[PDB]
Amino acid sequence: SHPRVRFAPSPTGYLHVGGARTALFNWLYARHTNGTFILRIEDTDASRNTPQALSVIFENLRWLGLDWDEGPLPDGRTIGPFGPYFQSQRNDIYEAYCKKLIDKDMAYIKEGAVLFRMPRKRIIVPDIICGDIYFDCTLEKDFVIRRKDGSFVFHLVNVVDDCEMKISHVIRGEDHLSNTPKHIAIFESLGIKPPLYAHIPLILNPEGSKMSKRDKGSSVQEYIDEGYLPKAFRNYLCLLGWSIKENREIFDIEEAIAKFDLTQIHRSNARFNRQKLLWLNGEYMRTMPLDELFPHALSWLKKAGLIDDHYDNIPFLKGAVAIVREKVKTGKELIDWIKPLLSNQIEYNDAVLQQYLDNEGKNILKEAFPYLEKVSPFHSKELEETIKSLAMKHGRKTADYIHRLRVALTGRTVGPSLYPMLEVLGKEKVLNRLHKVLFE
Template sequence: MSSIRVRFAPSPTGYLHVGGARTALFNWLYARHTKGTFVLRIEDTDRARNTPEAVRVLFEGLQWLGLDWDEGPLPDGSVRGDRGPYFQSERSAIYDRALRLLLDRNQAYESDGAIRFRMPRKKIVVEDLICGEVGFDCTLEQDFVIQRKDGSPVFHLVNVVDDLDMGISHVIRGEDHLSNTPKHLALAAALGGTAPRYAHIPLILNRSGSKMSKRDLGASLSEYLDGGYLPQAVRNYLCLLGWSLRENRELFSIEEAVERFELGQIHRSNARFDADKLLWMNGSYLRSLSPQEILPHAERWLESAGYPTGKWAPGYLQEVVLLVKEKVKTGKELVEWARPFLEEEVRFQPSAVKRFLNPDGIRALRELLADLSAAPDFAPSALEARFHSLAQVHGTSVRTYVHPARVATTGREVGPSLYPTLTILGKDRVLQRLRRAIETVAS
C-alpha cells in the first residue's frame, strides 16, 4: 500500500477559487497516480469569515469536478475514514497540546496576550519538488504569532500540527506559500515531527499578467457551474495550468491524467488563465458527448433556466439537444438556442425582423406557406428539396426563403441547421409560426 498522503486544506470564506480548484486537482491526481490517500481538511478557525454556506459551496465544487476524497468530512458534515474530524474548528484540543509543548520547551512565549514562536535565526533550505532548492536567510526573521490574543490559533500552527498529526507526506500548494515554508519547517522540527515534502505549484495569472484574484472575472468555480460548462472540460483545462502530457495534445481524459501525472513534470513558470481557451475546450467536449451522455447535463441546464423537462418526451428533448449542441459552446448557450423549441411564442430579435421580415421577406413567407401546406413529407431532405424547387420556380436564390423562414420560426438570424429545425418543430407548428409572422409584421 502506498504511503503517499496528500491534503487539500481550503478556508471556506466565500467560494472555491479556480486556483484552489487546481490545487485540489493536483493533490487528487497525485494521490490517485500513486494509489495514495487524498485528505480533505477544512481550515475554519477564522469564525468571523467562515460560513456554512461557504462550506456547502466548497463541497459542491469538489463534487462537481469529481474530486472525491478518502478522508475528511462528508458533504453532510459527517466524517469519512477513521481519523476525523477534519474541521479545524473541532480540533482545538490538539492545537492546545502543541502550544503547551512549545511553551514547555521554551520555543514559544507569551507577548501582549498572544503567543509567539521563537523563529530560529539561521539559514533554512527548502528542498522543493518543483522549485528546487530554495534558501531563506532567517537570521533577521521576527518571531511570529501562533495564537492570537483571543485564544484562536493562527494558520501557521494549525497547518503544521495537522500535517504532522495526519501523517501528510506531501504538501502540494500554490507558490505564494513558498515563503511560509521556512516557518513551517521550523515549527515541525520544534514539535519533534518530520515535515512533509513540499511541492509549490506555479501561480495562476489573469489577462493582465498579475496573480488571479477573487475579483477577476472567471475566478470562481461557481461561474462555470452556473454557466453550463462541463466538469470534464474544466478539469482538463485546470490540468493544463502548470502541467501537460508533454505532447502536442491538449484534450485528454482524467484517466490519462491520473496515469501520467508526476510532480516533477509540473512547469516552473506561472500559468496564464485563458477564458477563451477554456470556452473552446468546453465546446469541444460538449460536441463529443453521445446522446446518453449529454442529455442529463442538458436537462439540468434547462431545469435551472425554468424549463421543467418533464413537459416534453425524452425523445423530443434529445432531438433538440443533439441539433443545437453542434453550434454552442456552453450549456447556457444551449438553453438559449433551445428556447424556440420549448416555447410556443416566438421571441423575435428586432434586428432579425428588420433585416429579413421586410416586404420581400413577407412575400417569400407567403410563397413558402402555400408550398409547405401541401408538403406530404416534412423530413429534412424533403424540405430542402422543396426550398430549392420553390427558389427555382420563382427564379431566385434559396436564401430568399431560408432566412425569413428561420426568423419566422425561431425569431433569430442564426441558429442550427434550418431543415432539421423545421422537422423537429413539426409541420403544424411551422405553418402556424409562418402565419403568425406574416400577420404580426403585416399588421
C-alpha cells in the same frame, strides 16, 4: 501506495478557481501514486464559516468529479481515521503540541501569547515544483503561534495537522512559499521529518493580474451557473501549469492521472485564458454523449424555459438539445439558441423584420408555404429536396428561402441546422408560425 496529501480550504461561500486547481493537483497526485487524498477544513472565524459555505466546497468538488478519501461529509459526517478534520475541533491537539514546544524550550510565553523560537540559520526549501529555494533566516524574528486570545496561528496549525494526519506531500499555492521556512522549523523543533513541499505558481490573467476574490470568474460556481461542463472545466484546470508532452489540450482525467507528475508542473505562472476555456467547453459540448449532455441541459432549462419535469414532450426536448448542441459553446448559449424553439411567441426586432420579412421576403416565404405543407415525410432530407426544387423553380438561391425561414420561425439570423430544425419543430408548429407571420 504510500503518499498522503491534503487540500485544506476555508469556507467563505465560494470555491476559488485556484483553490479548485490546488484540490485537483492533490487529487491527481494521490490517484497517480495510489495514495490518499484528505480534506480538512480551516474554519477559523465563526462569522464567515457558515454551513452554506461548506456545502459549496462539497458540491463544487463533486461537480468536478473529485472525491476525497478522508474528511468531512454533509450532515455532520466524517470518514477517515486521522480526524476530526475541522480545525475548530482540534484545539486540544494544538495545545498539546504548543505545550510540548514550551517544555522543549522551543517556545516561550510572552505577554499572554506564545512565541516560537525561530531558528536563524540558512534554510533551503527543496520544493518539488520550484526547485531549491535558499532562504536566509538570520533576520527572521520569532513569531506568535498562539495569540493573546488563546487562538492558534496558521503557521503552527498546518504543521500540527500535517504531523497528526501523516501528510507526506504538501501541495499548495506559491503564496505559501515564503513561510515554509517557519513550517520546516517547527517540524524540526518537534523532531519530526518535514513533508516534501510542492508550491504551485499562481494563476495570472493575460495582463498580469491576479484573479482576485471579488472579480468576475474567480469562482467555480460562476462557471457552473454559466453552463460550463464538468469534464471540460476540469480538463482546463489541468492545463493551468501542466501539460501532457503531446500538448494536445483535450484529454480525459484517466490520462491525466496516468501521466500526472509534480516535477512536470510549469515553473512559470499559468495564464487564465477565458477564450481557450470557452473553446474547450464547446469541444465537450459538441462531442460528449447526448444522454450525458441532456441532464445538464434540463438543469439549465429549469432556470427559466421548462417546468419542473412536468414537461411532457421529452422527445422534442432531446431533439432540440441535440441540434443546438453541435453549434453552441456553453449552457448559456444553448438556452439562448433553444429559446425560440420552445417559445410560443417569437421575439422579432424591427431590423430583422425590414430585411428578411419585407414584402419581397413574404412573397419568397409564400412561394414555399404550399410545398412545406405538402411535403411528407417532414424530414431533413425531404425538406432540403423541397427547398432545392423551389430554388430551381423560381430562379432563386436556397439561401433566399433558408435564412428567411429561420427568421420567420425563430426571429434569429443564426441557429441550429435549418433542415434538422424544421424536422424537430414539426409540420404543425412550422406551418402555424409561417401562417401567422404571413397572414397577421
